[PDB]
């Protein structure tokens, strides 16, 4: 059942839908800004209506 799903193919003919690869290293959410704003009651809830 795995040969029938084209597991036999040359892996060099499989292209990403963008044609590119990617190495992402992004500074992310830590949560110190949101917890700080909650204690000061400035912006307690950050989730918007949308």
């Amino acid at each position: 059942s795995m040969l029938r799903n084209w597991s036999w193919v040359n892996v060099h003919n499989v292209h990403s839908v963008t044609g590119t690869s990617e190495n992402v290293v992004l500074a992310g959410y830590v949560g110190l800004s949101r917890t700080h704003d909650y204690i000061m009651d400035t912006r307690s809830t950050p989730a918007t209506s949308q």
Binding site: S16, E22, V24, L32
Partner: peptide, 15 residues
């Protein structure tokens, strides 16, 4: 996952 070649990482860094 034999042709993926793409990696994603996240930095929980602070100032």
């Amino acid at each position: 996952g034999r042709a993926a070649r793409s990696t994603v990482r996240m930095e929980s860094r602070i100032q």
